[PDB]
Amino acid sequence: SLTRIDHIGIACHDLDATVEFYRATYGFEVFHTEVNEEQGVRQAMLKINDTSDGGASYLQLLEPTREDSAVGKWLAKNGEGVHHIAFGTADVDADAADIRDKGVRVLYDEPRRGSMGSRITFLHPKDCHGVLTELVTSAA
Amino acid sequence: SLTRIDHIGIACHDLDATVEFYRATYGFEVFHTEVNEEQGVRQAMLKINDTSDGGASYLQLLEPTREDSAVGKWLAKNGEGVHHIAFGTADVDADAADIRDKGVRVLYDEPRRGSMGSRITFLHPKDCHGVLTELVTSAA
Ligand SMILES: CC(C(=O)SCCNC(=O)CCNC(=O)[C@H](O)C(C)(C)COP(=O)(O)OP(=O)(O)OC[C@H]1O[C@@H](n2cnc3c(N)ncnc32)[C@H](O)[C@@H]1OP(=O)(O)O)=[N+]([O-])[O-]
Ligand SMILES: CC(C(=O)SCCNC(=O)CCNC(=O)[C@H](O)C(C)(C)COP(=O)(O)OP(=O)(O)OC[C@H]1O[C@@H](n2cnc3c(N)ncnc32)[C@H](O)[C@@H]1OP(=O)(O)O)=[N+]([O-])[O-]
Ligand SMILES: [Cl-]
Ligand SMILES: [Cl-]
Ligand SMILES: [Co+2]
Ligand SMILES: [Co+2]
């Protein structure tokens, strides 16, 4: 089952500048930073709250590491802003299979590594009324 | 203080069809529906989780009631997808004044009515790295 909003994926041109914006404006602090070279992003997670399923909700700020990447292509076309939304589940493999069986395109055969060792997959935005939708199971 | 992600505002052409998509695909159900004629939207709130500040996190699906509205203009330009993000606070007036004092444009002098009697205001996307950002205090 999808039991929380896990995060909002926000694309930006300069991760350090946009991190500073969220810290200065709202008092949000950095929970974690990492590079995902497969995905072609440098990311920062800002934790906003805990959630009733035992998880948490974050802002995931993403700067592309290369133009030839999902986020690099998207920023070039659209400018900075919301790139995707992510829902948390205790079983991404099972939930992804159930959604594949409804005819919504699941972009990975098998979940891939995401933030903080999580396992993630994506649903095609053109099957989700224009919203790139991620499914995530936390490593813990 | 901004203590939760309150909701994701998602624009759609057909509220009933997009509600059905979220119900069929993810098992989300409708928590509330209402029309906001000032804002020019028909909305449905889908509750995803409760949050550690005592509040909750929703998907807010929005269909325009008129072309000449924030969401009608935006859908015509961009197609369906994420329109805004909303953060919850126990004092929208105080937090909005603190953010106005940082030079981020606050679009209302005074918070206006939002979902379920909430009081809301917005920050200009061009001051927030491309993200239309709402601040909301729940009526309870
Ligand atoms: C590490 C991690 C992350 O979140 S990494 C996040 C970055 N990685 C990802 O996004 C991977 C998944 N995304 C993708 O594979 C691709 O970007 C998509 C789903 C396949 C689209 O790739 P395409 O190469 O087909 O892009 P393309 O520009 O060709 O566009 C294909 C269609 O999708 C639309 N589209 C593309 N990106 C979109 C987005 N982010 N949201 C909504 N619509 C989108 C686009 O406007 C076009 O619509 P249109 O036909 O109406 O004009 N984490 O830890 O949580
Ligand atoms: C009831 C409720 C709701 O949430 S009601 C939600 C619907 N209402 C609202 O959005 C009200 C707040 N929004 C607004 O007043 C306006 O839409 C904005 C902030 C002023 C923009 O209005 P404008 O008439 O200036 O729009 P305009 O198309 O002229 O565009 C002005 C600039 O803002 C950008 N922009 C417009 N809408 C945007 C959005 N949703 N996200 C990001 N960028 C946006 C746009 O791309 C352009 O950038 P560019 O210059 O780089 O091209 N609730 O209960 O929670
Ligand atoms: Cl890596
Ligand atoms: Cl009304
Ligand atoms: Co993500
Ligand atoms: Co809203």
Side-chain angles (χ1 to χ4, degrees), chain A residues 4-111:
Chain A
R4 65 178 179 284
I5 298 176
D6 189 85
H7 63 266
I8 305 170
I10 296 171
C12 63
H13 288 304
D14 180 342
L15 184 64
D16 291 336
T18 303
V19 163
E20 179 57 17
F21 168 77
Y22 277 87
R23 189 211 55 79
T25 308
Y26 313 120
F28 301 153
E29 294 278 357
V30 178
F31 191 81
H32 188 61
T33 189
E34 70 186 298
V35 174
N36 192 306
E37 218 63 73
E38 174 181 48
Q39 292 290 350
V41 292
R42 187 152 138 261
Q43 70 169 274
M45 298 282 270
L46 325 178
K47 185 170 169 169
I48 312 308
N49 58 271
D50 286 296
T51 59
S52 53
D53 67 355
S57 297
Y58 308 85
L59 305 177
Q60 187 178 78
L61 306 176
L62 304 139
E63 176 186 324
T65 56
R66 75 179 163 261
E67 297 191 270
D68 183 17
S69 65
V71 173
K73 185 174 171 182
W74 188 93
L75 274 170
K77 163 130 164 262
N78 294 289
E80 299 193 304
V82 177
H83 176 256
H84 63 266
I85 75 172
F87 296 110
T89 165
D91 193 346
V92 55
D93 303 88
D95 276 321
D98 287 352
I99 292 164
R100 165 200 76 200
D101 289 348
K102 297 178 197 287
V104 172
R105 285 173 284 175
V106 176
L107 301 188
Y108 301 154
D109 281 295
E110 298 298 340

Side-chain angles (χ1 to χ4, degrees), chain B residues 113-126:
Chain B
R113 182 160 59 82
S115 181
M116 290 180 286
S118 63
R119 293 175 66 254
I120 71 177
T121 193
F122 292 91
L123 313 178
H124 200 293
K126 294 295 288 305

Side-chain angles (χ1 to χ4, degrees), chain B residues 66-123:
Chain B
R66 75 179 163 261
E67 297 191 270
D68 183 17
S69 65
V71 173
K73 185 174 171 182
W74 188 93
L75 274 170
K77 163 130 164 262
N78 294 289
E80 299 193 304
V82 177
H83 176 256
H84 63 266
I85 75 172
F87 296 110
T89 165
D91 193 346
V92 55
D93 303 88
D95 276 321
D98 287 352
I99 292 164
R100 165 200 76 200
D101 289 348
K102 297 178 197 287
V104 172
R105 285 173 284 175
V106 176
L107 301 188
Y108 301 154
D109 281 295
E110 298 298 340
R112 296 189 184 172
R113 182 160 59 82
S115 181
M116 290 180 286
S118 63
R119 293 175 66 254
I120 71 177
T121 193
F122 292 91
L123 313 178

Side-chain angles (χ1 to χ4, degrees), chain B residues 3-139:
Chain B
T3 53
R4 65 178 179 284
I5 298 176
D6 189 85
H7 63 266
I8 305 170
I10 296 171
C12 63
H13 288 304
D14 180 342
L15 184 64
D16 291 336
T18 303
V19 163
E20 179 57 17
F21 168 77
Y22 277 87
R23 189 211 55 79
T25 308
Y26 313 120
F28 301 153
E29 294 278 357
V30 178
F31 191 81
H32 188 61
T33 189
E34 70 186 298
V35 174
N36 192 306
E37 218 63 73
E38 174 181 48
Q39 292 290 350
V41 292
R42 187 152 138 261
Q43 70 169 274
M45 298 282 270
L46 325 178
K47 185 170 169 169
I48 312 308
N49 58 271
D50 286 296
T51 59
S52 53
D53 67 355
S57 297
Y58 308 85
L59 305 177
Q60 187 178 78
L61 306 176
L62 304 139
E63 176 186 324
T65 56
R66 75 179 163 261
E67 297 191 270
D68 183 17
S69 65
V71 173
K73 185 174 171 182
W74 188 93
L75 274 170
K77 163 130 164 262
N78 294 289
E80 299 193 304
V82 177
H83 176 256
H84 63 266
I85 75 172
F87 296 110
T89 165
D91 193 346
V92 55
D93 303 88
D95 276 321
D98 287 352
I99 292 164
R100 165 200 76 200
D101 289 348
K102 297 178 197 287
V104 172
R105 285 173 284 175
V106 176
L107 301 188
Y108 301 154
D109 281 295
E110 298 298 340
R112 296 189 184 172
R113 182 160 59 82
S115 181
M116 290 180 286
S118 63
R119 293 175 66 254
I120 71 177
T121 193
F122 292 91
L123 313 178
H124 200 293
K126 294 295 288 305
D127 297 343
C128 299
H129 290 281
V131 177
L132 175 60
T133 303
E134 174 187 346
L135 314 177
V136 55
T137 297
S138 299

